[PDB]
Paper text:
Kinetoplastids (such as Trypanosoma brucei), a group of evolutionarily divergent eukaryotes, have a unique set of kinetochore proteins that lack any significant homology to canonical kinetochore components. We previously identified KKT4 as a microtubule-binding kinetochore protein in T. brucei (throughout this manuscript we refer to KKT4 from Trypanosoma brucei unless stated otherwise) (Llauro et al., 2018). KKT4 directly binds to microtubules and maintains load-bearing attachments to both growing and shortening microtubule tips in vitro. KKT4 has the following predicted regions conserved among kinetoplastid species: an N-terminal α helix, a coiled-coil region and a block of basic residues in the microtubule-binding domain, and a BRCT domain at the C terminus.
Although we still failed to obtain diffraction-quality crystals from T. brucei, a crystal structure of KKT4117–218 from T. cruzi was solved at 1.9 Å resolution. TcKKT4117–218 is homologous to KKT4120–224 in T. brucei. The structure consists of two ∼150 Å long parallel α helices organized in a left-handed coiled-coil dimer; the helical structure starts at L118 and ends at D215. The coiled coil consists of eight regular heptad repeats starting at Y121 and ending at K176. Analysis with TWISTER shows that the six central heptads are characterized by an inter-helical distance of 4.84 ± 0.06 Å and a coiled-coil pitch (the periodicity of the coiled coil) of 136 ± 26 Å; this pitch is close to the theoretical value of 135 Å for a coiled coil. If the first and eighth heptad are included, the pitch increases to 163 ± 60 Å, indicating less supercoiling in these terminal heptads. Superposition of the coiled coils from T. cruzi and L. mexicana revealed a good structural match with a root-mean-square deviation (RMSD) of 1.03 Å (for 123 Cα), confirming the conservation of the coiled-coil structure in these species. Instead, we observed elevated B factors for the region where we might expect to find an unstructured linker in the TcKKT4 structure based on the sequence alignment. Unlike T. brucei KKT4, the coiled-coil fragments from T. cruzi and L. mexicana that were used in our structural analysis (TcKKT4117–218 and LmKKT4184–284) failed to bind microtubules in our co-sedimentation assay. A homology model for the two coiled-coil regions of T. brucei KKT4115–232 was built using the T. cruzi coiled-coil X-ray structure, and the sequence alignments confirmed using the RDC data.
Numbering used by the authors:
A (entry chain B): 116 to 215
B (entry chain A): 116 to 218
């Protein structure tokens, strides 16, 4: 009776002490895992941020190559039309000097 | 004394029980945060692979755009050479006919 009731409560106290020890080891294991994952997430968010800046940089660079090319084309076209006009001018002076 | 001995052990059992519940709650919060981190980890990893693929796609588009620009420049030079040759040949015909006329 009385001794048995007391030893049953002693045994429950020990069961709580051993479960507490187990949960302490598991909480320690979990904290190792959270810290490991937080080091990964922060490292991931950084490279994502660098890659977004990279994509926007390549997109800007493509608009720049197109802008330079369209200008190069316009300069070439202007220079060629003036060269053709120069030939026509020279031809007219030649005809004027030969035919008087 | 028998009663007092049991009641003192009862209070310790409450302290341990309450301490186990606090540790149970802490483990419950921790393992939930792990699961959220594992989800965010795969979500971020998926975006890294996307952005890397987007980078390689833009680099190929850039090289082909440069290649296309170089072809268009060569075709412009070709057409200009065509027109120069046509102008100079028309001026030579005009010369030949006008020198014939004044003969
Ligand atoms: C829980 C405890 O108080 C009880 N005496 C038992 O035997 O489990």
């Amino acid at each position: 009776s009385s001794l048995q009731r007391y030893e049953k409560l002693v045994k429950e106290c020990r069961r709580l002490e051993e479960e507490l020890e187990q949960k302490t080891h598991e909480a320690s294991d979990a904290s190792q895992r959270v810290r490991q994952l937080e080091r990964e997430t922060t490292r991931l968010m950084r490279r994502v941020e660098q890659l977004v800046s990279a994509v926007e940089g390549q997109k800007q660079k493509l608009d720049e190559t197109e802008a330079k090319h369209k200008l190069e084309l316009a300069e070439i076209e202007n220079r060629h039309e003036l060269e053709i006009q120069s030939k026509m001018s020279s031809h007219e002076e030649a005809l004027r000097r030969l035919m008087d």
